[PDB]
Amino acid sequence: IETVPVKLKPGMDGPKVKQWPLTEEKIKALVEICTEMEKEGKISKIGPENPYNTPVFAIKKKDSTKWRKLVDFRELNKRTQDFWEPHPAGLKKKKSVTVLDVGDAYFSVPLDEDFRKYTAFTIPSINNETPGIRYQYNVLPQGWKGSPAIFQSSMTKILEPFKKQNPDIVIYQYMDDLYVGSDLEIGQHRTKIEELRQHLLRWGLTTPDKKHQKEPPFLWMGYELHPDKWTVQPIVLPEKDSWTVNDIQKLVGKLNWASQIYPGIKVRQLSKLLRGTKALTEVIPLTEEAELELAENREILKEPVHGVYYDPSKDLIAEIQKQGQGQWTYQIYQEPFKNLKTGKYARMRGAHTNDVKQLTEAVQKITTESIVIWGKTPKFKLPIQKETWETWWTEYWQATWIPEWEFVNTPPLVKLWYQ
Amino acid sequence: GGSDIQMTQSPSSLSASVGDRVTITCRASQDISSYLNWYQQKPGKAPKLLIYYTSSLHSGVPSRFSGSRSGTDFTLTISSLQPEDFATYYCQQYSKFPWTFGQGTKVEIK
Amino acid sequence: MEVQLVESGGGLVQPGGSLRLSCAASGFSLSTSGIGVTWVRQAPGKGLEWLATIWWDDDNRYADSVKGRFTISADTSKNTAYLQMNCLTAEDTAVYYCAQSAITSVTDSAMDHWGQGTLVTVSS
Amino acid sequence: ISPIETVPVKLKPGMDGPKVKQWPLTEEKIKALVEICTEMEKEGKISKINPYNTPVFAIKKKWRKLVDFRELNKRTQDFWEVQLGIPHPAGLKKKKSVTVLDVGDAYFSVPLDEDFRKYTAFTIIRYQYNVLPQGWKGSPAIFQSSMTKILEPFKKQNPDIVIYQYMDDLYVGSDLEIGQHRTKIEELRQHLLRWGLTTPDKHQKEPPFLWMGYELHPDKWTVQPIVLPEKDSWTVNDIQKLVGKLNWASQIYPGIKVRQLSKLLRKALTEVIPLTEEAELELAENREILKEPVHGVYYDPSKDLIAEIQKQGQGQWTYQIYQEPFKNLKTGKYARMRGAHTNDVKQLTEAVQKITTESIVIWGKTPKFKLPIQKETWETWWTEYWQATWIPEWEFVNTPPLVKLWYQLEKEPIVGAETFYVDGAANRETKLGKAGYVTNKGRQKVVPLTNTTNQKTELQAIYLALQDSGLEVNIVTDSQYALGIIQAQPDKSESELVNQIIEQLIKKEKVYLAWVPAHKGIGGNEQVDKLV
DNA sequence: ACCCCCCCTTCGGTGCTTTGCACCGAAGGGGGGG
Structure with missing residues (x-):
């Protein structure tokens, strides 16, 4: 098969990202995969004359202890051309959506020769016993934003016979994964996904066929979705029958901040109860005019803000906060104070022991949700020190993609998203 | 099979009056992460799922019941013992098959 | 319909005899992905002992006490579960419950909606 | 001089050769410059047969020949060096027989790209380089990857012998007797000679081996002798060289402190600075630690790694990484002040991360930590802090001063x-x-x-x-x-x-x-x- | 004259705690290797 010409965005060179250290498990697992991929022509050995590099690490195969090979093509995707030469709004409505790893198809299509040098990565050595063993891809690499677009002409041909016989099944693709939504239940959705697994096999598309693990963690449950039951976490005011002047100060501050999102929130009647200079622990009864204002504020906070629509020309931003006792709250937005979704997570892996294991699970959860609702990956504002995150996050990663993220340190003045 | 995980509860029985605070521990013979379920079995009745995943209360369970974990030392606590709470409590692991139960802790009145 | 599990088939059995217990499931289908049934026995006065678990994908998990003797099955047509207990001894005299096993999330899996329990006694 | 295939190298798009002017040299300079330039032409390293030019100079060792390729390097293509780090003796395993070899005239034993030798022109009388010259930024990277390819067939044909290749330096060791070892070492010397690498017997089959600035012993290892400056009046350039050697010593000598000496660096490079009392005490404490000889042991993959952190005060920490008690694999220290405000708990977390990364580099796994913080003190911190924070498997050790929240x-x-x-x-x-x-x-x-x-x-x-x-x-x-x-x-x-x-x-x-x-x-x- | 790693201080760019303040990455001093 011929090769599609691939170029970079105008005025930008290739990626030059240093390789981070890897454990012995992953180094032994990466050299075993790279040799099998070099004997099969998928990758070819190179040297220091290639001035580009991108980080490579290892994750776990689905429902298995065998190691996988994952490349962090984030900086390369930012520099490759925009492949242009539709997102299903009903995918987020299906009773069930299953994710299928179809990245094996990419290892069959040869890659543009004048582009393979931008795909270089380096394998390190324990204690630097050996210098860097470099390679480059000859085929479409998994996790590269150009692979699904180049293969989009081929996949649409494969799925069209299946989509005809099943015209009520949405199929959306993002990177190496297929998002198959259906309205079936009582085992019917499970059987139809295996029909698609048999269809892809007849065209030569291998998919993970391992039996779902019965021992925790049930990581395979992350690939089984039910978007029709997803809820939003609204701003909630404290519910009390007796208030101290300290409770009302907290309440006024939370309302003053909430007014930046909801314009109809008023404070006058509640702040009128803090006119004197009384002790913080003193109970004050509420006037009939203040209770009416609190009721009208609760009524406003029931429904999300209107007049906020998704803009495909803009990027998505995801902010996450740690609430404690395994609780995490998040908001997705394109413009400030105009959230498209507010959610909450709880009872995640490491809820009793590991904050980093919780945060990585939440980041993958939010990203999977944003892929189903809008077809984009958000840019994350992670509440963690930079060195803490980069030390540990690869040990808990499971997706074939990696979203962009930055780090923040915003102490909680008020607890807005969780009361 | 000697590779099975062993769940050891302590004590095997205890006596408390209404309003007391009761603690019941259950130690696992190996690391089972946080994958533990607690069950309540009143006399003559079938077992009821009380707590799942170490600390999550099952639907319908009052706020006096709590579950915690310190490595392999799991703890079920009852803040304000009630007449409805006098039963036998079993811990159960599911980190690995075969699943195993603790020997049980009987909470009596005295 | 609420979730219900009703065991049946118990009774007195002679040494070396066998017995099949039924667990009729109402309120949920055994064909549902993530759903399984679980058998647990309790000797009179003693504690709970886990026995077997069949899952939605015909996956079976047995205890060492019953390996080679007990066989767990499921008929999705009648939406009931079975436990064929061969080679019974007096150490198998107990009340036998069937419970609903379900992998509900990445982290949650327990036993809920326990049946009333059927009694099995072996002579000696 | 080597039959290895040449490495295609180009220049940055839109650039030409150097074409610089050679600055005048002295009479004694051209003396050895005319004697050495003829020896390379006869040895097959250059050819005096190109409108470019690069300035050339010389520095006495005898003498030494070095060409200023700063204009060619500014116009040459970028490289990705294959040397990702520095090896460390704490990662070596105990070997029965050990040999260390070096390759003479390394850069001159690798043929340069034919279509690129044009730009390596220089006047003395104009020559052209036919091998990798010293001073060219691509020479080290191209040499290392060439050396690795040569050693691969040996390391594949002998999977029970370890070779630590650092540039042209080689560490070889195996569990064979002294006989088979000296035999297989000569098999290498002929293998590098077959590819065009001379091993001047810069050869040591003689313990203790001096490798990468250390001293390898059959059951121990230590750093090469460290001589601290013993100055009368201290100037800031003398203080900078002092803390630099103390940092190099803190990898095996535990308890090195540096903070007070570094506070004198807060600045003309030749200003005589009077030492404070604290800096004069810190230096004295460091001299006491260096008075006694300290060694380190080697790695044993069967035993677990253990790392122990102690608090030193004023935002200073030291640690020891060991498998058996009182036998350190290596030591180290952390004394960084990230942010304007912090506490001891934050800094301990930062030290656990530095030790984790360093342990992945040397051994490829995370050590089990022994920290001077109580489990309940850590529980209160990470369950209440608004930022995510975590520490791997660790146990509390009661070696005061403990870490607490004040x-x-x-x-x-x-x-x-x-x-x-x-x-x-x-x-x-x-x-x-x-x-x-x-x-x-x-x-x-x-x-x-x-x-x-x-x-x-x-x-x-x-x-x-x-x-x-x-x-x-x-x-x-x-x-x-x-x-x-x-x-x-x-x-x-x-x-x-x-x-x-x-x-x-x-x-x-x-x-x-x-x-x-x-x-x-x-x-x-x-x-x-x-x-x- | 070239290439790699480490620590410590300084400085400038960058986005909120907003016109001050904090954090971070590069550069320049030193150590070490070839």
Whole structure:
């Protein structure tokens, strides 16, 4: 098969990202995969004359202890051309959506020769016993934003016979994964996904066929979705029958901040109860005019803000906060104070022991949700020190993609998203 | 099979009056992460799922019941013992098959 | 319909005899992905002992006490579960419950909606 | 001189050769420059047969030939060097027989790209380089990857012998007897000779082996002798070289401190600086540690890695990584001040990360940590902090001074405690402001401030309330900046004003901090707002 | 004259705690390797 010409965005060179250290498990697992991929022509050995590099690490195969090979093509995707030469709004409505790893198809299509040098990565050595063993891809690499677009002409041909016989099944693709939504239940959705697994096999598309693990963690449950039951976490005011002047100060501050999102929130009647200079622990009864204002504020906070629509020309931003006792709250937005979704997570892996294991699970959860609702990956504002995150996050990663993220340190003045 | 995980509860029985605070521990013979379920079995009745995943209360369970974990030392606590709470409590692991139960802790009145 | 599990088939059995217990499931289908049934026995006065678990994908998990003797099955047509207990001894005299096993999330899996329990006694 | 295939190298797009002017040389310089340039032409390393030119100089060793390729390097293509790090003897396993070899004339034993030799022109009388020249930025990277390909068929045909290739330096060892070892070593010497690498017997089959600046022994290892400067009057350039060697020593010598000596570097490079008392004590303590000889052991993959961190004070930490007690694989230290405000718990987390990364590099796994912090102290920190934080498998060890949290802000307001309402304000152009408080019991006070900012006034108002209150006090303010600092529970800061607040909070019994929005009519905050 | 790693201090860019303040990455001093 011929090769599609691939170029970079105008005025930008290739990626030059240093390789981070890897454990012995992953180094032994990466050299075993790279040799099998070099004997099969998928990758070819190179040297220091290639001035580009991108980080490579290892994750776990689905429902298995065998190691996988994952490349962090984030900086390369930012520099490759925009492949242009539709997102299903009903995918987020299906009773069930299953994710299928179809990245094996990419290892069959040869890659543009004048582009393979931008795909270089380096394998390190324990204690630097050996210098860097470099390679480059000859085929479409998994996790590269150009692979699904180049293969989009081929996949649409494969799925069209299946989509005809099943015209009520949405199929959306993002990177190496297929998002198959259906309205079936009582085992019917499970059987139809295996029909698609048999269809892809007849065209030569291998998919993970391992039996779902019965021992925790049930990581395979992350690939089984039910978007029709997803809820939003609204701003909630404290519910009390007796208030101290300290409770009302907290309440006024939370309302003053909430007014930046909801314009109809008023404070006058509640702040009128803090006119004197009384002790913080003193109970004050509420006037009939203040209770009416609190009721009208609760009524406003029931429904999300209107007049906020998704803009495909803009990027998505995801902010996450740690609430404690395994609780995490998040908001997705394109413009400030105009959230498209507010959610909450709880009872995640490491809820009793590991904050980093919780945060990585939440980041993958939010990203999977944003892929189903809008077809984009958000840019994350992670509440963690930079060195803490980069030390540990690869040990808990499971997706074939990696979203962009930055780090923040915003102490909680008020607890807005969780009361 | 000697590779099975062993769940050891302590004590095997205890006596408390209404309003007391009761603690019941259950130690696992190996690391089972946080994958533990607690069950309540009143006399003559079938077992009821009380707590799942170490600390999550099952639907319908009052706020006096709590579950915690310190490595392999799991703890079920009852803040304000009630007449409805006098039963036998079993811990159960599911980190690995075969699943195993603790020997049980009987909470009596005295 | 609420979730219900009703065991049946118990009774007195002679040494070396066998017995099949039924667990009729109402309120949920055994064909549902993530759903399984679980058998647990309790000797009179003693504690709970886990026995077997069949899952939605015909996956079976047995205890060492019953390996080679007990066989767990499921008929999705009648939406009931079975436990064929061969080679019974007096150490198998107990009340036998069937419970609903379900992998509900990445982290949650327990036993809920326990049946009333059927009694099995072996002579000696 | 080597049959290996050439490495295609180009130049940056839109650039030409150097074409620089050679600056004049002395009479004694061209003497050896004419004697060595002829030896390379006869040896097959150059050819005097190209409008480019690069300046050339020489420095006595005898002499030495070095060409200034700074203009060619600025025009040559970029490279990705294959040397990702530095090996460390703590990662080596115990070997019965060991040999260390070096390759002479390494860069001159590798043929340069034919289509690129044009740009390697220089006048003395003009020559052209036919091998990798010294001074060209691509020469080291191209040599290393060439050396690796040569050693691959040997290392594949002998999977029970370890070769630590660093540039042209080789460490070889195996569990074979001294006979088979010296035999297989000669098999290598002929293998590198077959590819065009001379091994001048710069050869050691003689313990103790001097490798990478260390001293490898059959059952131990140590760093090569370290000679600290013993100066009369200390100048800043002498202090810089002192802390540099102490850092190099802290990898096996435990308990090295450097902070006080480095505080003298805070600056003309030749100014004689008088040592402080503390810096003169720190240097003396370091000299005491270096007086006794300390060694390290080798790695054993069957045993677990253990890392133990001790607190040294003033934001200084040291650690030892060991598998068997009292036999260190290596040591190290952490003494970095990330951020303006921090505490001992944050820094310990940062040290656990540095040790983790360093352990992945050397051994490829995370050690089990032994830390001087109680499990309940760590539980309180990470379950309450707003940022995610975690530490791998670790156990508490009671070697004081333990790590603790020196105070705690109350979650609910204190009943029966005098509540305060502080606020601060300053003028941007005037650069002058004030900060005061108004209590619920009627007390009032305002203190004028000079040469402060808006944030400095809001912190000063909190300081006043803590001074004019008892062991228990409630404080209400508008500064969310001041809360973001105090809520992080810092024990050490760079600003003197915050450290004054830190000491005040430890003296108290209960302190409650709360935030209210300004200009919304909150009584107390509205009263003290007009007073500033 | 070239290439790699480490620590410590300084400085400038960058986004909120907003026109001050904090955090971070590069550069320049030193150590070490070839």
